[PDB]
Amino acid sequence: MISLIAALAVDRVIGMENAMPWNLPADLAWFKRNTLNKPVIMGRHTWESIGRPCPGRKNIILSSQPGTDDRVTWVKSVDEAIAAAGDVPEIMVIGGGRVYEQFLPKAQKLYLTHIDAEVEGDTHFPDYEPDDWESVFSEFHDADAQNSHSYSFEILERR
Ligand SMILES: NC(=O)c1ccc[n+]([C@@H]2O[C@H](COP(=O)([O-])OP(=O)(O)OC[C@H]3O[C@@H](n4cnc5c(N)ncnc54)[C@H](OP(=O)(O)O)[C@@H]3O)[C@@H](O)[C@H]2O)c1
Ligand SMILES: CN(Cc1cnc2nc(N)nc(N)c2n1)c1ccc(C(=O)N[C@@H](CCC(=O)O)C(=O)O)cc1
Ligand SMILES: [Ca+2]
Ligand SMILES: [Ca+2]
Fold first, then answer.
1. What is the dihedral of CA 34, 38, 44, 46, to 10 degrees?
2. What stretches of the chain adopt beta strand conformation (E)?
3. CATH number, domain at 97?
4. Ligand 2 touching residue 49 (CB < 6 A)
5. Does residue 151 contact residue 27 with C-beta atoms inside 8 Å?
6. Does any ligand 2 atom lie closer than 6 A to the CB of residue 42?
7. Cβ proximity of 43 and 61 under 8 Å
8. What gap in Å lies between CA 9 and CA 60, rounded to an integer?
9. Number of domains in the chain
10. 96 lies in which domain range?
11. What are the coiled-coil residue ranges (predicted)?
């Protein structure tokens, strides 16, 4: 299946000036745990903010232009992106804004981190209805030494 994984703040803010504006180690671990051994799909701007392939995962980058780095697999369309992922149980779509928008109607699961931080973004997660998504897991955690904000993990399954 196709799954989306994303950290959101207030107003579903996901990013600002090509970066993510918070400090949350608990989220990185959760991300690593749910994506390791999976193919990961991302847009070119998200690729350019990471710059090294996500190790232990097949890396597929969407771009309308020819690839500029042979450590990763480049694809020119959403259908080419899914085909390059081959026959796996779960393909992870990991950002950014424009990529989430395109894959959201094809997705069966969402893994979300709701971070209780009020920041300004120039990129937002698509608007999603509970009419379509059932919550099968959610945990809330208070801020601590490593994590400056409270945050909750949730897994939703399409209805
Ligand atoms: N909060 C999170 O969990 C999270 C996760 C990841 C990223 N982010 C943030 O999201 C922001 C980047 O988001 P973004 O929406 O600007 O960019 P993005 O979605 O990462 O990348 C957009 C680019 O991807 C390519 N692309 C997307 N769809 C394509 C398609 N269907 N066919 C061909 N190319 C396609 C295009 O590249 P060309 O111009 O080369 O054609 C497009 O300009 C950053 O601030 C990043 O930090 C947040
Ligand atoms: C820019 N970016 C995208 C990113 C970050 N956190 C996310 N968190 C969630 N929940 N969802 C995402 N899509 C997501 N995406 C990043 C930034 C750093 C690393 C990163 O290097 N993660 C390490 C974890 C260990 C470390 O950060 O040093 C890894 O190897 O997976 C990955 C993606
Ligand atoms: Ca580097
Ligand atoms: Ca059902």
1. 20
2. 2-8, 13-15, 40-43, 59-62, 73-75, 91-95, 109-115, 123-124, 133-141, 151-158
3. 3.40.430.10
4. yes
5. yes
6. no
7. yes
8. 26
9. 1
10. 1-159
11. none
